[PDB]
């Protein structure tokens, strides 16, 4: 009896995630009939610590038994494509790895990692390029996200 | 002696059709976007359209989305910009320049131009 | 369709000493801003990408800055091959956009 909801990611520049081979997402700019292959996120809201402008959160995507996760990789946080068994999943409670915190500093959406605080969903400036785990957010990485509801 | 080379431009008749080919020597374009860049006589650069041949993503600028169409033979390492429905507007030197963000590649290299002037 | 607004349009200067070109963004681009080099009749090369990032093979006199709306190109001491156009380029926002150019003319 968990709360999820469907939705698609668009970044502060305004590039889509896409699916990048099986394991890996990329945001570019879609023009037209390219935009119907923005991957769809089943967002499920969980339990987790909830500070002033700060919602837990988990990220999937719709029947492709994929969660984002943030593991380390050489001592560093890096976001991870997994795979789950799609009869247990979608769950309240979460193991961390799959936990995000919906922060709302502007107008606007970030998404720290549970496991790893200070570890944000990023994008490069060039497009077609990974997203990734980013440890600023006063780097030169884009960490700024608007969401679009989908049904 | 990495290179983009261009060729089929030249003098149309206003309405007509020309297709544009850049031919890249030197990389594969297969994981590379495609940019098409133009300048009008005494003017500056504008943004015309890119492509990434693999995925088939394309993207044009206002002015021309509907009219022209970009696409890649990736078997042949070459780009094509395909122009309808010519005006006086779209007389310029086209470019093509590569784009990969991964290698900073941010149109580090262009093509020599090929000057396209529709004229009755 | 996010303007590039460049300036001056047209500047003068002597070899040795240092020049400043300016862009201003009609709103905020990031760090995703280019400059490029047009010697005339010829392609535009690359010169500084993602704002403040030198290019390989550039000359380290060719430097950038930029803060979100307002980004800056300097050479630290003209030398002989630096006769050029210079422009700076928006990626982040598509479409790419430009600006209209500087014109650096070396004064005798």
């Known amino acids: 009896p968990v709360r999820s909801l469907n939705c698609t990611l668009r970044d502060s520049q305004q590039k889509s995630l896409v699916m990048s081979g099986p394991y890996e997402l990329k945001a570019l700019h879609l023009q037209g009939q390219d935009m119907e292959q923005q991957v769809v996120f089943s967002m499920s809201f969980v339990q987790g610590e909830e500070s002033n402008d700060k919602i837990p959160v988990a990220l999937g995507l719709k029947e492709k038994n994929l969660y984002l996760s943030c593991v380390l990789k050489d001592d560093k946080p890096t976001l991870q494509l997994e795979s789950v068994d799609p009869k247990n999943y979608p769950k309240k409670k979460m193991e961390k790895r799959f936990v995000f915190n919906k922060i709302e500093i502007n107008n606007k959406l970030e998404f720290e990692s549970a496991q790893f605080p200070n570890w944000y969903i990023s994008t490069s400036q060039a497009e077609n390029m990974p997203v990734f785990l980013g440890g600023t957010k006063g780097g030169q990485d884009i960490t700024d996200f608007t969401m679009q509801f989908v049904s | 002696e990495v290179q983009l080379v261009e060729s089929g431009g030249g003098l149309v008749q206003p309405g007509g059709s020309l297709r544009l080919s850049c031919a890249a020597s030197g990389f594969t374009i297969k994981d590379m976007a495609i940019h098409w860049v133009r300048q009008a006589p005494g003017k500056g650069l504008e943004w015309v359209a890119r492509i990434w041949p693999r995925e088939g993503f394309t993207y044009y600028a206002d002015s021309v989305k509907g009219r022209f169409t970009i696409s890649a033979d990736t078997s042949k390492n070459t780009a094509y910009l395909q122009m309808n429905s010519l005006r006086a507007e779209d007389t310029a030197v086209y470019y093509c320049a590569r784009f990969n963000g991964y290698w900073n590649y941010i149109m580090d290299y262009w093509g020599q131009g090929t000057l396209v002037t529709v004229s009755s | 369709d996010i303007q590039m607004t460049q300036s001056p349009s047209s500047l003068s200067a002597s070899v040795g000493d240092r020049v400043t070109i300016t862009c201003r963004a009609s709103?905020?681009?990031?760090?995703?801003v280019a400059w490029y080099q047009q010697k005339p009749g010829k392609a535009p090369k690359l010169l500084i990408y993602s704002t403040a990032s030198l290019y390989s093979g550039v000359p380290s006199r060719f430097s950038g800055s930029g803060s979100g709306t307002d980004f800056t190109l300097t050479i630290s001491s003209l030398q002989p091959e630096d006769f050029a156009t210079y422009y700076c380029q928006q990626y982040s926002n598509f479409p790419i956009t430009f600006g209209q150019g500087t014109k650096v003319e070396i004064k005798r």
């Open positions: 709103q905020d681009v990031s760090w995703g």
